């Protein structure tokens, strides 16, 4: 009986370990890969939005 | 055509105009969105990571 | 908080059981 | 799918059917005891719709159904809707054909004998189950539990019913049957919710206050002082979401309806709650069984799982009980699901397997069987 | 212009005001619950022209106004158009001012706790009434029909209410608040007659619909059988004529409508209509209670007026309810007007001085005191 | 969370300290 008590143990803190690091790596790896990503969109998106408005104003002209 | 043009021109403006207004709704959407994204996941993560640590006690 | 809600049980359920015997102990003269 | 005629197991209530078979620790699926029909006339042609929708499905088009129990109080009142439960309970969601399987179905001690002669011939005439057995929920509960004797608390959706055994054997002198269940703590919310501003009359209505108690109701260790705070201000409310985007915002109403447990005249039930009906179950046994009762209030059944009911519990009954003595209440985190459990383990007990019905006896005898063998 | 500081009385509903002083025997005065706006931009100049106008105003300039009910199924949320209506009532009608008088204001026993807080906090903030009294419409009903005992059926313009009160008492489980009311009657009105080739969608065609309701409806003994002659044959019909010199011609809408009070899913209601929720208000409580409340449904409020409507319900009642046991409805001529003579019993009863929340008690506590002071 | 720290120690020591007790008294008794 008592050693189910200390498997409980073993499994929750062999879960707290892993946990504390998939948690907190699961989410920098997808969180920092989602920011650099979306960084690059967002900023390939700006210079895409400046750039149609740039030809926007082209077209204007012409 | 000119009336169809002017339609269309006036469409490719609306159209393209909803196109860069949705990809700036959209960047203004999914960048405040990563926020919570990024964070959402991050405070509920840490908080669970803390927790297999805030319950060794 | 799963890990308490177990922890929370072994513990009651220990301490609860700890002091039966502790207070039986001296009971029972 | 199964390799052996194991039986299958349900427990059926006002509110929901476990279902699982026999030999397991848990049961498979889950379904609400609901038969589902449209209240509306239809106009696009080609949307196929059933007539009748079952459990889940019955919930999940419940936007323009009326959705209705076969179940009250601890019977079957609708057996044709349970027929279709029992169906799609065994076979589309545990696909196992009670054909080829014996099936054991559960009831309270002085449940009518009319309910179980029913889940008999249903049964053996509509499924063709080779054996039948109908189980006492209060030995079942005692099974999970690892215990022989206690008070069985099955304080559900339909009736409590509050039975005492000891060494295995029934005290029937000193159940206390109660008209008092989870279907009228959700009833009590509903009209006092209605006070603060938010009616609810309809079905769809019903089921997201049955979802609101489910989510953010207790009973309270201590409810009188628990209210003067929640009911003096907003540090003790709690928000729900609404279906729609609304919200609703509960304060000691939160605690109020499952306090009807405690305090039946809120619902103008002639009671003094669950914890005397307990008590008294204990006190009306004799005085060598009492010390064992006293150790062993268990907890089977929804509404058990309100916080602060395992505490409240064992507190309101130290309070009724003679000193020295030690009262325990048996509430584990497997609390309730006791009932599903046990039906598991006994329906695979090796003791237990003469006490099945088959289909022969029945035939011979008709579904008045029941009442002779299971018990 | 009262010679004594004889309490108000009146009853502000989502359809009629109904208003007199304490102790008399009927309203003095009766008119609908409006506050009127113009929709049009004024072009001459020395016109006078109000804001908004209240009352018969706003009914009698109603060509360009816009009209609004303050009070929605029962509720108070227009506060500000009701302190209008309120003058209106005490100062052009009764000449009187809530200053120098008590007042009496009333609710159903499920209505939300706001509106008995609003319209308490209006008559001492800004009409200084020494006093206030927040009546159950329930409790006056039962005043004014000469019961202690019976069932409430107070299906007036905006809620149904269905209550149980035993010896004076409440069995509050047992209430079925119904969303099914006159109101709805007059817009599915609207709806059938537009099915006529007649259709009403704005203000004045709804005040037009609303007296179309009021001279030619009814409810009939049996529906389908007048159902049937009114579809075949002109004998059953009746013409209305409207302020604008159009005649319309009515048939089996004259009925149709009204019976969505024993069948609302006419308008789209899950409900099994009011004989079933009176029938099942009495079957909750005890058969030493059942056997008082079934020969005592009583009639309050409009609707219940209507040819046929206590038989209609006493029948379905009858049919659902046990036999040997008599069923009866009690539908006085002091109908639609009664709840207000209600509050006019109590508020010249000697027992009663005692429940009125002061002026004093009311700044200490705030409007919340309402909650603990009338009931 | 101080709820968590500081009654799971508290509940912890219940248990032991009425462990301990229950050994003593019963060595008495």
Same mark, same amino acid.
């Given at each position: 009986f008592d050693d189910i008590h200390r498997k409980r143990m073993e499994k929750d803190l062999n879960e707290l370990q892993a946990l504390i690091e998939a948690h907190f790596e699961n989410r920098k790896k997808e969180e920092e890969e989602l920011v650099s990503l979306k960084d690059r969109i967002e900023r390939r998106r700006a210079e895409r939005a400046e750039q149609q408005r740039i030809r926007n104003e082209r077209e204007k002209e012409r | 055509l000119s009336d169809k043009l002017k339609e269309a021109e006036t469409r490719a403006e609306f159209a393209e105009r909803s196109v860069t207004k949705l990809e700036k709704s959209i960047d203004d959407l999914e960048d405040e969105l990563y926020a919570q994204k990024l964070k959402y996941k991050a405070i509920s993560e840490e908080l669970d990571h803390a927790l297999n640590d805030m319950t060794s006690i | 908080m799963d890990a308490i809600k177990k922890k929370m049980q072994m513990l009651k359920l220990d301490k609860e059981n700890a002091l039966d015997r502790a207070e039986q102990a001296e009971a029972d003269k | 799918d199964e390799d052996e005629t194991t039986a299958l197991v349900c427990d059926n209530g006002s509110g929901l059917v476990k279902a699982g078979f026999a030999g397991?620790? /848990?049961?498979?699926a889950v379904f609400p005891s609901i038969v589902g029909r449209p209240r509306h006339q239809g106009?696009? %042609?080609?949307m196929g719709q059933k007539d009748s929708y079952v459990g889940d499905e019955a919930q999940s088009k419940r936007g323009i159904l009326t959705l209705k129990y076969p179940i009250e109080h601890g019977i079957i009142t609708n057996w044709d809707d349970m027929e279709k439960i029992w169906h799609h309970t065994f076979?589309? *969601?545990?696909? %196992? /054909?009670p054909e080829e399987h014996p099936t054991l179905l559960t009831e309270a001690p002085? @449940?009518?004998?009319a309910n179980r002669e029913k889940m008999t011939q249903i049964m053996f *005439?509509?499924? @063709? %189950?080779p054996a039948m057995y109908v189980a006492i929920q209060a030995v079942l509960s005692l099974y999970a539990s690892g215990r022989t004797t206690g008070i069985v608390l099955?304080?559900?959706?339909? %009736?409590?019913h509050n039975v005492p055994i000891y060494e295995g054997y029934a005290?029937?002198?000193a159940i206390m049957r109660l008209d008092l269940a989870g279907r009228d703590l959700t009833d009590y919310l509903m009209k006092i919710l209605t006070e603060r501003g938010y009616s609810f009359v309809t079905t769809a209505e019903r089921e997201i206050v049955r979802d609101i108690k489910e989510k953010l109701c207790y009973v309270a260790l201590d409810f009188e002082n628990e209210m003067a705070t929640a009911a003096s201000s907003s540090s003790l409310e709690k928000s729900y979401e609404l279906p729609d985007g609304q919200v609703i915002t509960i304060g000691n109403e939160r605690f109020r309806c499952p306090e009807t447990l405690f305090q039946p005249s809120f619902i103008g039930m002639e009671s003094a709650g669950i914890h005397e009906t307990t008590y008294n179950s204990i006190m009306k046994c004799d005085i060598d069984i009492r010390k064992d009762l006293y150790a062993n209030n268990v907890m089977s059944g929804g509404?058990?799982?309100?916080?602060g009911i395992a505490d409240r519990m064992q507190k309101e009954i130290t309070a009724l009980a003679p000193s020295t003595m030690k009262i325990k209440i048996i509430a584990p985190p497997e609390r309730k699901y006791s009932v599903w459990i046990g039906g598991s383990i006994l329906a695979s007990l090796s003791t237990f397997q003469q006490m099945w019905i088959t289909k022969q006896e029945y035939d011979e /005898?008709?579904?008045?069987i029941v009442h002779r063998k299971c018990f």
């Amino acid at each position: 009986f008592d050693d189910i008590h200390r498997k409980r143990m073993e499994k929750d803190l062999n879960e707290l370990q892993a946990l504390i690091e998939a948690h907190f790596e699961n989410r920098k790896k997808e969180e920092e890969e989602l920011v650099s990503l979306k960084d690059r969109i967002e900023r390939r998106r700006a210079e895409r939005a400046e750039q149609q408005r740039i030809r926007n104003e082209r077209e204007k002209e012409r | 055509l000119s009336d169809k043009l002017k339609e269309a021109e006036t469409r490719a403006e609306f159209a393209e105009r909803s196109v860069t207004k949705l990809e700036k709704s959209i960047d203004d959407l999914e960048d405040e969105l990563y926020a919570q994204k990024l964070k959402y996941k991050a405070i509920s993560e840490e908080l669970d990571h803390a927790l297999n640590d805030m319950t060794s006690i | 908080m799963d890990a308490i809600k177990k922890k929370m049980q072994m513990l009651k359920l220990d301490k609860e059981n700890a002091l039966d015997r502790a207070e039986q102990a001296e009971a029972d003269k | 799918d199964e390799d052996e005629t194991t039986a299958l197991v349900c427990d059926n209530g006002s509110g929901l059917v476990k279902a699982g078979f026999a030999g397991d620790d /848990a049961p498979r699926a889950v379904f609400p005891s609901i038969v589902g029909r449209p209240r509306h006339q239809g106009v696009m %042609v080609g949307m196929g719709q059933k007539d009748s929708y079952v459990g889940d499905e019955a919930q999940s088009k419940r936007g323009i159904l009326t959705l209705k129990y076969p179940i009250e109080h601890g019977i079957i009142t609708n057996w044709d809707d349970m027929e279709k439960i029992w169906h799609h309970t065994f076979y589309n *969601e545990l696909r %196992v /054909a009670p054909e080829e399987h014996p099936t054991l179905l559960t009831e309270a001690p002085l @449940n009518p004998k009319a309910n179980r002669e029913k889940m008999t011939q249903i049964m053996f *005439e509509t499924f @063709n %189950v080779p054996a039948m057995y109908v189980a006492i929920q209060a030995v079942l509960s005692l099974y999970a539990s690892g215990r022989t004797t206690g008070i069985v608390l099955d304080s559900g959706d339909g %009736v409590t019913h509050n039975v005492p055994i000891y060494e295995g054997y029934a005290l029937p002198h000193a159940i206390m049957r109660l008209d008092l269940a989870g279907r009228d703590l959700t009833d009590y919310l509903m009209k006092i919710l209605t006070e603060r501003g938010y009616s609810f009359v309809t079905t769809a209505e019903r089921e997201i206050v049955r979802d609101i108690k489910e989510k953010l109701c207790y009973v309270a260790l201590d409810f009188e002082n628990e209210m003067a705070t929640a009911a003096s201000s907003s540090s003790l409310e709690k928000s729900y979401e609404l279906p729609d985007g609304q919200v609703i915002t509960i304060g000691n109403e939160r605690f109020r309806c499952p306090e009807t447990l405690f305090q039946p005249s809120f619902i103008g039930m002639e009671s003094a709650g669950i914890h005397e009906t307990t008590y008294n179950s204990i006190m009306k046994c004799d005085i060598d069984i009492r010390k064992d009762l006293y150790a062993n209030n268990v907890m089977s059944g929804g509404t058990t799982m309100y916080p602060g009911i395992a505490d409240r519990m064992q507190k309101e009954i130290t309070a009724l009980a003679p000193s020295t003595m030690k009262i325990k209440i048996i509430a584990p985190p497997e609390r309730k699901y006791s009932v599903w459990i046990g039906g598991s383990i006994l329906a695979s007990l090796s003791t237990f397997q003469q006490m099945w019905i088959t289909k022969q006896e029945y035939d011979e /005898a008709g579904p008045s069987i029941v009442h002779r063998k299971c018990f």
